[PDB]
Ligand binder design. Structure first.
Ligand code: COH
Ligand code: COH
Ligand SMILES: [Cl-]
Ligand SMILES: [Cl-]
Lengths: 110, 110
C-alpha cells in the first residue's frame, strides 16, 4: 500500500513568506490523526513577484488525509485563517491557495 | 541554516508514470552524500494528458545537494538517462524535466 502526499500551495504577497511560515510552528491537532507521518513547510527559491509557501503532508494513505480533512482539528487549525480575497481578509498576505495530491511510489529515509 | 529540498519534475507521456517510478527503486549512491536525508518519488493525481512524476530530495543544507550534483555518483546514476528529444532517446517517455529548490522553514515527523 502506498503512502500519500498532500500539498497546499500558498501564493503570497512579496516578502510575506517568513511571517507566514512562522504561523505553522505550533501544532493544532494534526499529530493526533491516525496515519499522519510528516509535515514540511517550504519557501520556493526563485525571482518571482510573489512569494510561494508550500505545506506538504505525508500520510500512510489517502484515506488518512481525508479523515483529517473531515476532522474537527482541521477546522480548529483553520478557524482564523483568511485569504486576501475574503470579505474580512484585509490583513492577509495570502492571495490564493491551491491543493495538489500525490501517490508516493517510493520513499527512502537515512 | 535550514534544511533544504530539491525537486526534479518529470513531464512524462501519458501512461508511463509506473515504469518511470520503478527506475528509482535501485539506489545509485545519493545516500552516501553527507547531508542527504530523504528521497520521495511521487505521481501527481490529476486529469491532465501527460503524467507527472516528482523526485523530492531532502538535505541538511543546499551545499550538500550541490555536492551531490557535482559528484561521481550523480553522473553514474544518470549516465543512461535520455529525454525523448535526444538523438538516441526516441523510446524514452520523459518529455522534459524542471528543477525546483526550496528552503525548508519547518519540519515535523511523528
Ligand atoms: C492539503 C492540506 C491543507 C489544506 C487543504 C489547507 C487549507 C488552507 C487554506 C485554504 C483553504 C489556507 C489559506 C491555509 C493556511 C493555513 N493553514 Co492550512 N491547509 C492544509 C495544510 C495545513 C496543515 C497540515 C496545517 C497545520 C495543522 C495542525 O494541526 O498543526 C495548516 C494550518 C494552516 C495555517 C497556520 C495556522 C494558523 O494560522 O492558525 C495557515 C495560515 N494547514 N490552509
Ligand atoms: C534535483 C535533483 C535531480 C536532478 C537535477 C536530476 C536530473 C535528471 C534529469 C535531467 C537531465 C532526468 C531526465 C532525470 C531522470 C532520472 N533520474 Co534524476 N535527477 C535528480 C534526482 C534524482 C535522484 C535523487 C535519482 C536517484 C539517485 C540515486 O543515487 O539513487 C535520480 C535518478 C534518475 C533516474 C533513474 C535512474 C536510472 O534510470 O538509471 C531517472 C530516469 N535522479 N534526472
Ligand atoms: Cl496550509
Ligand atoms: Cl529525477
Amino acid at each position: 500500500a502506498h503512502m500519500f502526499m498532500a500539498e497546499n500551495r500558498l501564493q503570497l504577497q512579496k516578502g510575506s513568506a517568513e511571517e507566514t511560515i512562522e504561523r505553522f510552528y505550533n501544532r493544532q491537532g494534526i499529530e493526533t490523526i491516525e496515519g499522519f507521518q510528516q509535515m514540511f513547510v517550504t519557501k520556493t527559491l526563485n525571482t518571482e513577484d510573489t512569494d510561494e509557501v508550500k505545506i506538504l503532508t505525508i500520510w500512510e494513505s489517502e484515506d488518512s488525509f481525508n479523515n483529517w480533512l473531515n476532522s474537527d482539528v482541521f477546522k480548529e487549525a483553520h478557524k482564523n485563517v483568511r485569504l486576501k480575497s475574503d470579505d474580512d481578509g484585509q490583513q492577509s498576505p495570502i492571495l490564493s491557495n491551491k491543493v495538489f495530491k500525490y501517490d508516493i511510489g517510493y520513499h527512502y529515509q537515512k
